[PDB]
């Protein structure tokens, strides 16, 4: 929900400053930092194996 709102905000901001491509780019979306509670060792081992 907050990312939909943030994308709306950023598209509006791009529209204000020209940036016609950015204003109409509804496919772009914000990226959130990981909220998973996992140990460093497990995450690194899994991602290295992947």
């Amino acid at each position: 929900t907050f990312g939909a709102a943030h994308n709306q905000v950023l598209r509006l901001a791009a529209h204000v400053e020209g940036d016609t491509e950015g204003a109409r780019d509804f496919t772009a979306s914000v990226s959130w930092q990981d909220t998973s509670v996992r140990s460093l060792a497990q995450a690194v081992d899994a991602y290295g194996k992947a």
Partner: protein, 51 residues
């Protein structure tokens, strides 16, 4: 993937912590010509490999 020979691209989406947008980003930038990308694509344990 190693034993049954499943397509790894389809198995990327089943790994927790990776979304389909990230999968598409990986797909588009998998074979970039940048030196860093090529070294990471050919990364042996004892440093870069390949060319």
């Amino acid at each position: 993937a190693t034993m049954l020979g499943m397509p790894k691209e389809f198995l990327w989406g089943l790994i927790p912590g990776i979304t389909k947008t990230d999968v598409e980003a990986m797909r588009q930038h998998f074979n970039d010509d940048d030196e860093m990308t090529q070294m990471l694509l050919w990364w042996t344990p004892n440093g870069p490999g390949g060319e």
